[PDB]
């Protein structure tokens, strides 16, 4: 019966809440209250990559931390050289509606995807000299919101049909499908060891998914609205989510509960992108009040504002070597702050 | 200078890439993009058929104008999480079946969707080419089934001539930003070969209004 099962369902939820409350004895602020604050941090626009003629919707830094790709609504997938300004590749998309992009760890492949419900894998290193389509992954019944490359043959895609899927590029089929979400999955981030990943969805809950076992492992609630962004801590034992209620939250993998609440009274907009620093001290969040923000990830204080954009910030990314942070806004431009 | 041969050739390649990107953007700037947002398959397929997965795209040229219709209804997701991708569309071609007033009612849900689209933050100044599609079946069924089934407050007679006017005015009622948006209602027939003509007329009027607004005349 529905109520008969709901009885022990709510009993188990209460037991989980009681265990989470009993595992807490002190907040993160109470622990790291005696640490020297990071102080005010200044950021200057070192480079300004221009050339897009529409809204920029995603961006991913390469492993070498010099190449970066950007996806925009005009149908272009520009690959930038970030140390200089000049471009490398200009890939005309089949469908102009793209909301996510990715860069392979080996640098040979770049992904895309959007309202066409199809993830496209582009082979950059071709003998023929032009960027082709290596595979066109179909099988999602909703818009793709975030795709991340596991390796050169596996990609984890998160779609708007409340499902995340693990693919195989050569075969083209879904190796594993991660069910359990009730709202539209909006963002994705893999672990440093690429054996776990977390996905945030519109039902204000982020779940830890085992990419090898194939089922959800933990459930993290706490947000009051849609989770537009998510990112793992560099240690892999934590991750930070940015929701639509002007609040970034830090979750713990082993404590399995709240750690921090990075919210300010002067912001009522919605976080669109979240990324961490190399040492995990500076949590960068791209907000909807036209500028990015910097948060001390151990305290709750601010550190600086990356105010250099005309339209809102949609994508954020800190390089693998930790040198710079790039914010790509909705107007036309990506700015490489450092 | 202080650039080697490879950096100079890379700069030349990026210059050429930006040149073709600018050319493609200039080509796509003159091309009209229309959002076809119907309700419950109330004439989407018929409207697409009489002229010219995820997003269905249809492009057609009609007497020195390139149009682009984005059929959306095959999404079944949260509309507010991707409806901001359609900023800057020239018009929002709606589609409403008049015969669905006696089918909780389909016309009431059509009104709800029209209110949700008119009172939308992103579409605060985009005109709506409303298309009352099924008028023949409405004309045949209006003699037997009265409009009081759908509208208990109706005071008009049974004839289609004023019933269609009541439907049109009720559909224009839910508009709130009347100073920016203009709803170009039209009635579609089976033999109506001028639906694309009315789309062209409404799009030219929208373009003229946009040019007047940019020039300061409006």
């Amino acid at each position: 019966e529905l109520d008969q099962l709901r009885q022990e369902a709510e009993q188990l939820k209460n037991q989980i809440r009681d265990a989470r409350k009993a595992c807490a004895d002190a907040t993160l602020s109470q622990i790291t209250n005696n640490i020297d604050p990071v102080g005010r941090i200044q950021m200057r626009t070192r480079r300004t990559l221009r050339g897009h003629l529409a809204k920029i919707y995603a961006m991913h830094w390469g492993t070498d931390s010099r190449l970066l790709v950007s996806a925009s609504q005009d149908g272009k997938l520009i690959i930038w050289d970030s140390y200089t300004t000049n471009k490398v590749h200009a890939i005309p998309l089949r469908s102009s509606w793209v909301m996510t992009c990715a860069y392979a760890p080996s640098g040979n492949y770049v992904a895309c995807g959007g309202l066409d419900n199809i993830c496209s894998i582009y082979n950059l290193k071709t003998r023929e000299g032009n960027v082709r389509v290596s595979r066109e992954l179909a099988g999602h019944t909703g818009y793709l919101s975030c795709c991340r490359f596991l390796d050169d043959n596996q990609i984890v895609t998160s779609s708007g049909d409340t499902t995340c899927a693990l693919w195989d590029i050569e075969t083209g089929q879904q190796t594993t499908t991660f069910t359990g979400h009730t709202g539209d999955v909006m963002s994705l981030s893999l672990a440093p060891d690429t054996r776990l990943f977390v996905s945030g969805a519109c039902d204000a809950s982020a779940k830890l998914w085992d990419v090898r076992e194939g089922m959800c492992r933990q459930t993290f609630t706490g947000h009051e609205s849609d989770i537009n962004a998510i990112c793992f801590f560099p240690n892999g034992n934590a991750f930070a989510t940015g929701s639509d209620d002007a609040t970034c939250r830090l979750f713990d993998l082993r404590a399995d509960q709240e750690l921090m609440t990075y919210s300010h009274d002067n912001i009522i907009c919605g976080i669109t992108s979240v990324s961490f620093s190399k040492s995990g001290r500076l949590l960068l969040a791209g907000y909807d009040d036209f500028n990015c923000n910097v948060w001390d990830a151990l305290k709750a204080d601010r550190a600086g504002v990356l105010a250099g954009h005309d339209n809102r910030v949609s994508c954020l990314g800190v390089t693998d070597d930790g040198m710079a942070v790039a914010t790509g806004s909705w107007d036309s431009f990506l700015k490489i702050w450092n | 200078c202080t650039l080697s041969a490879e950096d100079k050739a890379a700069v030349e390649r990026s210059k050429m890439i930006d040149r073709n990107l600018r050319e493609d953007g200039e080509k796509a700037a003159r091309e009209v993009k229309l959002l076809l947002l119907g309700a419950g398959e109330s004439g989407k397929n018929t409207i697409v058929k009489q002229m010219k997965t995820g997003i269905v795209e249809t492009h057609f040229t009609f007497k020195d104008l390139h149009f682009k219709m984005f059929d959306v209804g095959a999404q079944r997701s949260e509309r507010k999480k991707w409806i901001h991708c359609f900023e800057g569309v020239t018009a929002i071609i709606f589609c409403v079946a008049l015969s669905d007033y006696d089918l909780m009612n389909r016309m009431h849900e059509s009104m709800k969707l029209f209110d949700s689209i008119c009172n939308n933050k992103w579409f605060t100044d985009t005109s709506i080419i409303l298309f009352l599609n099924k008028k023949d079946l409405f004309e045949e069924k209006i003699k037997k089934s009265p409009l009081t089934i759908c509208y208990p407050e109706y005071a008009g007679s049974n004839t289609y001539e004023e019933a269609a006017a009541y439907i049109q005015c009720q559909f224009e009622d839910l508009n709130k930003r009347k100073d920016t948006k203009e709803i170009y209602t039209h009635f579609t027939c089976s033999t109506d070969t001028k639906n694309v003509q009315f789309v062209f007329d409404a799009v030219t009027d929208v373009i003229i209004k946009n040019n007047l607004k940019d020039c300061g005349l409006f």
Partner: single-chain antibody
Framework: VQLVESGGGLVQPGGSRKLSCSAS????????MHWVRQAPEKGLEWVAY????????YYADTVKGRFTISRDDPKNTLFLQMTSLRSEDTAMYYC??????????????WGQGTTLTVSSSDIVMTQATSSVPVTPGESVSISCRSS???????????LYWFLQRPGQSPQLLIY???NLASGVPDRFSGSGSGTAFTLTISRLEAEDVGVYYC?????????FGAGTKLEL
């Protein structure tokens, strides 16, 4: 990919001949193309270069003004209209594709080349060895010394290695002195810094028998090296 060559033959001194290099298979419009001559008894030598989209165009000091080079992206053909022939132009002309972006491999594929028989501040690179007898399975080191250090302020030495098996066109082995070209075995390994460069072969087989050349790529008057022929 393919680059089939048409032209050559007996040309009188002071005449004119027109060499057609018709690409087939790859994106010819995105590829800067070169020409590389080779005398019947000497090493390789540079000729000219057109950037992508017929932009910048350079020439060697010897062939400046006499040679004109053009491309036709419609037909995927690229030409070399050369004037004022003499006995010094008796060579075999390879057209070499080269695409320049960050991380690319210029000079990766070489055309077949047509021989041309005529009736009767450059960074010099020195390879003192000209013939190294060796047995298969023995590690071989081939040294290349320049006159000016190729290490630009960016941090990459623009030195290139090539291998010319007897009877076929050269192929890129090492690009930028420390990067393996795609399609070659992993035994090859180039190294060095400044003006002294060496290439270390781990294991040798029967297909490694061939001449080994050098390219500088700092400024566009590129100078080849006296090829150190490898043989058993």
């Amino acid at each position: 990919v393919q680059l089939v060559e048409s032209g050559g033959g007996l040309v009188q001194p002071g005449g004119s001949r027109k060499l057609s290099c018709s690409a087939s298979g790859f994106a010819f419009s995105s590829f800067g193309m070169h020409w590389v001559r080779q005398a019947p008894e000497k090493g390789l030598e540079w000729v000219a270069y057109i950037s992508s989209g017929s932009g910048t165009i350079y020439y060697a000091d010897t062939v400046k003004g006499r040679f004109t080079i053009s491309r036709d992206d419609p037909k995927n053909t690229l030409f070399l209209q050369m004037t004022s022939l003499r006995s010094e132009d008796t060579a075999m002309y390879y057209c070499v594709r080269s695409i320049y972006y960050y991380g690319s491999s210029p000079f990766d594929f070489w055309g077949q080349g047509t021989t041309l028989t005529v009736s009767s501040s450059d960074i010099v690179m020195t390879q003192a060895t000209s013939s190294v007898p060796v047995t298969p399975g023995e590690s071989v080191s081939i040294s290349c010394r320049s006159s000016k250090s190729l290490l630009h302020s960016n941090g990459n030495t623009y030195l290139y290695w090539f291998l010319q098996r007897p009877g076929q066109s050269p192929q890129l082995l090492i690009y930028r002195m420390s990067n393996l070209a795609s399609g070659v075995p992993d035994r090859f390994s180039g190294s060095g810094s400044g003006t002294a460069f060496t290439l270390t072969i781990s294991r040798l087989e029967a297909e490694d028998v061939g001449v080994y050349y050098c390219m500088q790529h700092l400024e566009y008057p590129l100078t080849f090296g006296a090829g150190t022929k490898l043989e058993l």
